[PDB]
Amino acid sequence: ATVLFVKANNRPAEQAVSVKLYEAFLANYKEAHPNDTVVELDLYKEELPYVGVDMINGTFKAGKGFDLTEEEAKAVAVADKYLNQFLEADKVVFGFPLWNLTIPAVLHTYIDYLNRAGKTFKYTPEGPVGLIGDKKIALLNARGGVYSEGPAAEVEMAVKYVASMMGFFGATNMETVIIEGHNQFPDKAEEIIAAGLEEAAKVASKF
Amino acid sequence: ATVLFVKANNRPAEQAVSVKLYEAFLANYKEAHPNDTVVELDLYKEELPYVGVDMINGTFKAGKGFDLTEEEAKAVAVADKYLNQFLEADKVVFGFPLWNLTIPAVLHTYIDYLNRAGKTFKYTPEGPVGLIGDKKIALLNARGGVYSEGPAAEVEMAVKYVASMMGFFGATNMETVIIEGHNQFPDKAEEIIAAGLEEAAKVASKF
Numbered sequence: 274a275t276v277l278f279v280k281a282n283n284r285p286a287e288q289a290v291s292v293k294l295y296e297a298f299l300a301n302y303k304e305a306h307p308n309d310t311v312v313e314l315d316l317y318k319e320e321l322p323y324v325g326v327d328m329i330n331g332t333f334k335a336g337k338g339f340d341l342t343e344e345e346a347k348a349v350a351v352a353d354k355y356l357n358q359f360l361e362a363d364k365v366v367f368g369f370p371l372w373n374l375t376i377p378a379v380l381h382t383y384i385d386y387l388n389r390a391g392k393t394f395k396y397t398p399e400g401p402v403g404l405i406g407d408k409k410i411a412l413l414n415a416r417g418g419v420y421s422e423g424p425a426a427e428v429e430m431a432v433k434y435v436a437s438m439m440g441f442f443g444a445t446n447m448e449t450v451i452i453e454g455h456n457q458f459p460d461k462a463e464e465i466i467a468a469g470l471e472e473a474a475k476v477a478s479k480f
Numbered sequence: 481a482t483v484l485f486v487k488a489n490n491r492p493a494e495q496a497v498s499v500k501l502y503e504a505f506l507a508n509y510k511e512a513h514p515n516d517t518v519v520e521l522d523l524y525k526e527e528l529p530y531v532g533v534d535m536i537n538g539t540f541k542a543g544k545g546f547d548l549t550e551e552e553a554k555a556v557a558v559a560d561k562y563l564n565q566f567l568e569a570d571k572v573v574f575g576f577p578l579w580n581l582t583i584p585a586v587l588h589t590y591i592d593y594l595n596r597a598g599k600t601f602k603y604t605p606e607g608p609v610g611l612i613g614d615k616k617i618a619l620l621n622a623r624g625g626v627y628s629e630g631p632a633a634e635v636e637m638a639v640k641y642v643a644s645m646m647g648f649f650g651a652t653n654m655e656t657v658i659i660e661g662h663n664q665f666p667d668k669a670e671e672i673i674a675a676g677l678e679e680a681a682k683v684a685s686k687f
């Protein structure tokens with residue numbers, strides 16, 4: 274199988290729990306699957322121009338017989354590169370922190386590139402239908418406070434954002450590994466983090 | 481007063497409801513407050529490097545007085561420029577669409593830059609307290625579908641995102657003008673858009 278790892282954090286593992294989690298899942302995945310093709314995409318090593326008018330118009334027009342501007346075609350070429358790589362993968366693993374309630378803006382731009390009629394969803398008379406139902410997806414997230422319960426739960430917009438968009442694209446039975454609360458309950462941080470790394474190992478073995 | 485308009489959509493006004501909404505609020509605000517200083521910040525005209533390790537380490541180390549690498553110092557300086565402008569404004573008006581459930585990634589990066597201990601919030605033994613209580617904020621949003629009720633209400637992450645972060649910074653009694661449902665209910669689009677632009681004019685006249 275071809276497996277794409279999308280890394281959305283360039284902090285060192287020693288300082289960033291989401292990075293420690295991503296690296297553990299990655300190492301465990303490779304150990305269990307020596308003959309898979311595993312590809313890492315580090316969003317901080319890429320040039321990710323923000324989506325705006327030229328990308329919106331270019332991706333709408335592409336393939337429909339319209340003229341494109343040079344700038345529209347440049348924008349389409351960027352989105353196509355990421356979109357085609359994502360579509361080629363049999364499994365996709367996203368590793369990201371919660372920062373300021375949500376995902377890193379680098380990952381927000383990457384997911385914007387994935388939204389394309391005819392590629393990740395199609396229109397029907399009954400509404401949009403997702404086209405990635407055959408892809409296995411894992412979401413690996415770390416967050417300092419607890420967001421699964423308590424007063425912050427209603428403003429969690431990191432895992433919720435990625436799961437909502439992947440669900441729209443048609444992904445089902447996504448796996449999620451979440452390490453939360455290590456900043457909020459610092460006395461238990463070591464055990465909270467270790468427990469997440471164990472869970473990552475178990476999920477990666479079956480993924 | 482000094483009023484900062486933050487524009488997050490470079491589609492022409494003829495093709496974009498959120499840009500009509502922004503331009504109507506802007507024109508009406510100026511007409512009604514001819515002697516106020518109005519400054520427009522067009523996020524698509526700016527260079528907005530993504531937040532990652534250099535910004536994070538840079539702001540952490542600046543707070544400690546530790547030496548900054550070139551890249552850390554440059555990152556802090558970029559954030560400073562935008563943060564200082566936001567802090568100097570008496571009122572701030574944000575104009576943005578809902579794209580892919582959320583705000584444009586350009587506005588996501590902009591808001592990331594505003595988060596700073598001692599500037600937009602401070603720590604207390606009882607938890608963080610926001611420091612912008614004095615600042616009047618308007619949120620102008622357009623969205624194709626209805627997100628105020630129905631099956632999609634649960635995944636609105638555009639207005640909810642900006643309102644949550646501004647609230648954390650301590651903004652109170654923010655004004656919100658939303659134009660929603662013009663793509664979902666095309667038979668009502670003319671009425672919905674016209675009503676929304678009238679509301680923006682009214683709110684701007686009193687802002």
Ligand SMILES: Cc1cc2nc3c(=O)[nH]c(=O)nc-3n(C[C@H](O)[C@H](O)[C@H](O)COP(=O)(O)O)c2cc1C
Nearest residue numbers: 288289290291292370371372373374415416417418
């Ligand atoms: C820029 C930034 C913003 C953050 N925002 C939040 C937040 O909104 N809520 C929270 O509980 N923790 C927040 N944290 C703490 C992180 O969620 C925590 O460190 C988690 O491990 C993911 O970040 P990391 O993998 O980079 O360490 C933030 C950390 C950083 C560096």
Ligand SMILES: Cc1cc2nc3c(=O)[nH]c(=O)nc-3n(C[C@H](O)[C@H](O)[C@H](O)COP(=O)(O)O)c2cc1C
Nearest residue numbers: 496497498499577578579580581622623624625663
């Ligand atoms: C790139 C893009 C993504 C969009 N995503 C959504 C969406 O998730 N939900 C929705 O109801 N409408 C969506 N729309 C429609 C816009 O919310 C809406 O109709 C209005 O166009 C805001 O976009 P605008 O001000 O640029 O026109 C999207 C439009 C664009 C161009």
